[model samples]
Target chain A: PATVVAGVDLGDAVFAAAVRAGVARVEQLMDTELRQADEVMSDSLLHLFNAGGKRFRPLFTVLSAQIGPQPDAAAVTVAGAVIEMIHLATLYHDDVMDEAQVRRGAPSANAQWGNNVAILAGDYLLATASRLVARLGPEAVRIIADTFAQLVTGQMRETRGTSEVDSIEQYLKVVQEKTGSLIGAAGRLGGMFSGATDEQVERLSRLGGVVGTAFQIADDIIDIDSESDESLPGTDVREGVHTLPMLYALRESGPDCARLRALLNGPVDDDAEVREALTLLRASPGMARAKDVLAQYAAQARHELALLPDVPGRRALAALVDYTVSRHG
Target chain B: PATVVAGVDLGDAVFAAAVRAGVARVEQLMDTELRQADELKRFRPLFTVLSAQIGPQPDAAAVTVAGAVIEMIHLATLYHDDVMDAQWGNNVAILAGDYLLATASRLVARLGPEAVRIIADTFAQLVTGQMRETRGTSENVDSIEQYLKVVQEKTGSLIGAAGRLGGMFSGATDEQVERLSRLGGVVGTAFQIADDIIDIDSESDESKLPGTDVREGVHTLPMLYALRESGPDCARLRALLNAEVREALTLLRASPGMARAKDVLAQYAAQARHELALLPDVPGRRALAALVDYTVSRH
Candidate 1:
């Protein structure tokens, strides 16, 4: 809980940096190139960028660009703006899909604007972002488009699998495609803009992928281990989205496991029951095993960093793996 | 209902032709062009060779040569398909807007796919319909962008109008933008075209503009009079569009001699109404105007 608390505080500073960077890029493009679409896009984007939200995606995009060539400010900005657009669009779509009332501690766009506007606006943002990408020409646009396809496929796969699968592999595959792809793509995309060598881009992308998997694993662990207003201990079980904890718990046949699966498969609407399941997961050897996997990936990520010439940014990126895994939240 | 029944009769033939032409374009362009994201665009142009939705905003960038080269295949196919299939071309056809231009080898590189795809969907069909007026001029030897503009203002104007009335106009502009400009544009557009010069982008101004300096002698007044029976059915349509709430119910509200004025007014209204119907029903001011036009026209 303390680590999670500390990460949130640190993540806030990074988020601010990311937002400022995103807004700057958006503004420059808006003033020079996208001056027209800017009347609509810039104000809207700046509002969201400046408003409090985790800036993980935009930061990743900016950093990703730096990995190859010194980041082309314009290209990185477009990537940053696109990352926010994608994040917002995905949230809008998720709101419609989840029919949730709150997001980022506020009423979801769908909740506020109605699903149609949210859906259409989400689409419009994505379309506009792609238009910007197209403006950058084929290479930039194609890679982003491929990433977009992966993002959507991941969502589709996760949605499709939430109720169908009971295995750890299925869950991991979902996380890798859905979450890992973006994290990985962000770094690689930054490298692509940097005019980084192919080797650099590939290595960076690998690092992102590894770090991203560890992050997700950490998230799974924290949901059980931490107590927070946002944390949904055993929430995945209720939704039947088997995570590592649940899958690991399934390997045993004690009453705790039985009750956990029962609540997951059936509608046991008790918060206590949910907490009990989380408690069962915490006591299991699965926590230690998950931590080992995260450590292993983090080591690989640091190893990749070792290949890079020493730079402040590169050091920070190496530091990010620890930051990503150690933070409880 | 019988009109829907009757429309089914009239709509099918042209719809088939348009669909065939459209599908052919889709087939031809799929493998060759539309595969690259950089080559695609969002706007569904009606084959005019220029990106129509550039809007009224000012621009700072130099209009590069890489403008409007390839055209949106999705929009072209959709427009041709809709024009042929619907038997009536609403301003913004469905399937017209969703275009992603695939990067291509030759020809498309200069304009960038955005401009090219926009042009393809917006103008390619009209450009294809007529033969080259001259050998080399990229200007469709047949018509100008203005003439195509008229066609859109007249027939296809409804997409924006529909979206306006439907309340989905948030992505575009205000009702003031639609109201002030769209109607006049539609009117001027219908007037300028109707002849071959106006209908196709390849036609000359001498043919398009009525009563040019050369053709002052043999004005076709009689044909105009007879086509008043047709005149694109404008007279009956004008009354429907300009009618206020409850003003249309009684026929005797105005002088009996005002029939032609009513007719012209009514036809313009019909054109506007057609445009209004194309938008998603987003709940806006002019929504009733569309339905009311349909009702008054029925009466």
Candidate 2:
């Protein structure tokens, strides 16, 4: 792997090496945390745990730890595992809801087993996550509980999408609540468990919100811009899930809007229909608009980093923010 | 309301008033806890059922909060359970259940670390029970035995936790807490068996139609027993069960397993009463014994 991801080069090899070690420990703990006495639960719970992920949440956790003195390696690793488990739990439930076939480059749990099994497996993971966090102390438990509440509220809002609020406002709220809050906790935990100052913890959490929103917007762009191996492009389009690009496209009153609306009015299961909608979205100014929003969020994230001390962890975080928008390129 | 239920007396006035007051507080807390940002959450009535079961107690505030925590946990499981059902929308149930689980953790943590540990352990047990129900006797255990184990874990564990919480918050002794937990487990299991018996016996006043579980392919005790019989009538019984609900209910009700299933239900009720016998001769104990009799006599 390159010492530099995006423009911010990680100058500290020691810090880099420690993160790799932390990731390894997190991976090991993820395995142990998912163990169940029941064979079915063991298999279903391990399904997504074994299917690989970017481990970005844990990475944020480990990096945040480096900002403060008395960085407890075990605590950071467990915190990372807890956040990642929450992410995995959401994915399991989401796939069942979306009837999604693939995730993290493998068959989704719902696709492999039935929805009931997948749902139960997700609940089991959340239980295990709560159990682990309870060991960390009451404050940590309270934080996780709040994060989970935000997560569910986000999903609930998304389910009642664009009903009461304007499309963009509801869209932004959903993205911030569903994606940003947990990622914010990922950053918050890193600072919190490592004994960082209150100011640093708050800034890191806010940084997480901005960067997390940017990441999702970039992903929404990817859903329309013919992105590669992680997933098929335009899955959101096919599933009729509204994204930033789609929302932007709908804001226009021209012929392109009408055509895009017609194409996306229902399920885009037909291959040719999906192709046509993708081409139209790529050609529209919607892609550029979404990209600008992504950049704005990424810039906000970088501004938050400016308040922190000039450390390798800060640089790594900046690089992550850079990568969030740069993934489009 | 009558002071006596079934064969047990619950005292004349004071005890009834106390139980009513405790239940009312639990109801209020339940209302407060479920006041979510999203409103569809009010559709679930589990909290009401759970709060109603709380015994009359001392430590009024802690007991009321503990009652809320127990039901919140139970409601959390129910949300997930709804997700497992095909009829319910998966997304709504998952989020709803998760919201309840998070709230439950938040409240339980405030009660102290001990409550958190109890809730977490109960969660693990509940999941294990559900898993066993899904995977059903893969280790060559008898199907009926495995079924009973699943019931004990799935139904008995949480109810036991509820009883334990009731006792703990009331400042009861450790032995009394253990006895209350056992009473809950026995009574909960008996109630489930009685429900199974009622399903076969074509009992009126059931919320669901008779043989609904049969139509859905849920194997109750009688159905499992009928499957195990080796006689010619047993063969016809199985064949009829494989067909439609009306015929199956008629034939199965006439079968030998129906009588045997009633006997099993009565045995469980007896066991619940036996567990209650070990506890002190208090009004709560009497109420609990009456609950056991009510459980079996519901058919």
Candidate 3:
């Protein structure tokens, strides 16, 4: 009714608290500005912070902190912010690559600032974040580096991932790099930074890998299965993206997939046919089963976090499972 | 056919030397791997050092320790690369703003990695050269808090300037920031003494101010008149900027003024501390004169 993503506010509240905590400390470390030279630089930081995405990464940081021995606020916050900064900065650069303009109801950085500025700003934020995290200690710094490499690998794979999409198994494997690796890494690192035992961090990492995949799968569901009237539909469709919907729909709908492909494979010059193809996707079982797949992975996520004892943080992680499933946007 | 900017080449050589010096020192401060990281940043710095357009600014801390000052050099390269990367990372976050493709370049705990792999690899280089000289500084860490709030000022001004631009001119009383304010504060605080003398003698000394040569009006007559008459003189100067043989006329025009200005400028110019001291009169001036002569002759 509020036109909000179903659990968007809850995610916002959770993330905002953690982010504020991170920013407060960062402000102290960097100090209040003596000059306005950092306006653009700071604006880059705000691009990610002021946006409307889920703050699940930082939540994991805090939850891991809760489960750790010392519960160091500084450690957890630094780790959280670093992860988000990497995630968001890359997101900005990626948006430029996609050449699409809309994002979180605001113009993409690339759209507003041009590709050069977006790219530069993205690098600036990433560098600034890296410089800060390196000060935390060498071991932690190395850990961050390792994850960064995975991120790059994942990105490289995703950029060129369709090579094996002919099979569902190959498609699922692609998620390891495209979606699962970094998010899973985020969870494990959060646990490690919070001082969790090696065993604990490992368990969370596996859980993260599963859940992250499920979350991505759900996103594919939203693109094809949902209707425009019900919610904004076919995000991947409009851009000619191939996801579970198209994948499953191809297998299930027979020649209907070819019809949809005809619309997507080209410039979509004919508006009428575009609408026709979209309508077919909205009615596909590929879209329908994708929802079930999302639930299966979400259940796996809950089961993983459920093993971490019945603490409030664990419950919060449980709540996140519900939140991911219920996302309306 | 070789083009030269005269004294500017001296500045160039000095800058190159400074970069080498800084690199040597940087090598000592960091380990081998970190040194490799620094090397990544150098990709763009080498470009700035070689570009002929960089002679106007007074080289101080940045000029002496070239690597330390050119974070903007890295920034420039980043802009270039980002332009390329953005075109490549185009992800699904379109329209929603929440999912951005910049997420493509994520790294974990790679401490020096971003400095080397990202900033050094691209962005800072462009920002350094393209940025307005007056406002250049790395964020808030470069200046002080008290100076940031000049109470008498109701507007913003550039860093390094001494007396206001056009302070000596008529028909303009509005005090504005000078281009060199940041440099003056950071490195040239003591060199502004020539201003008091130039202001006192603007109307009379040819050696001090070119056309009228001496009586101190509002600003230094030479600098002021140079400021006043420079509008037309700049066109000739601009032409000489790209030409090597035509530089003579530019030198004749700007040199007489510069020579006269130099007499007034001698003490202040030499008095610049740190890397500023390395660049002054004598060999420095001679090398500069040669650069101008060569540049003019070719132009």
On DockQ, the leading prediction is 2
Q: Give the Å shift of residue A323 in candidate 2.
A: 2.4
Least accurate 10 contiguous residues by lDDT in model 2 chain B: B41-50
TM-score of chain B taken alone, every candidate: 0.25, 0.83, 0.25
The lDDT per prediction is 0.45, 0.72, 0.45
lDDT of 2: 0.72
lDDT over C-alpha atoms for residue A119 of model 3: 57
The full ranking of all candidates by lDDT, starting with the best, is: 2, 1, 3
Q: Please give the ranking of all candidate structures by TM-score, highest first, separated by commas.
A: 2, 3, 1
Chain A TM per candidate, in order of listing: 0.81, 0.93, 0.81
lDDT by residue (tens digit), candidate 1, B1-299 = 22121111213344334323332443454445444321112111111101112222111011211122223422333342232111012212211222222122122333344533333222222222111211112232222343354345323332332222212112235543354235433433333233222211122433344223112211111212222343433454234322132222122123232343335435656775565455334332232232224322321
Which stretches of candidate 3 lie above 4 Å from their native place?
Answer: A1-37, A42-45, A70-72, A161-174, A226-233, A266-274, B1-299
Task: Please provide, for model 2 over A180-259, each residue's C-alpha lDDT reduced to its tens digit, 9 standing for 90 to 100.
Answer: 88889888888888889999999888888777778778878877885664556787777677888888888877898899
Worst 10 residues of 3 chain B by lDDT: B150-159
- Candidate 1 TM-score, C-alpha based: 0.55
Select the stronger candidate by TM-score from 1 and 2. 2
Highest lDDT, which number?
Answer: 2
**Candidate 3 chain A least-lDDT 10 residues:** A1-10
**What value does the TM-score of chain B take for model 3?**
0.25
Write down the DockQ of candidate 2.
0.55
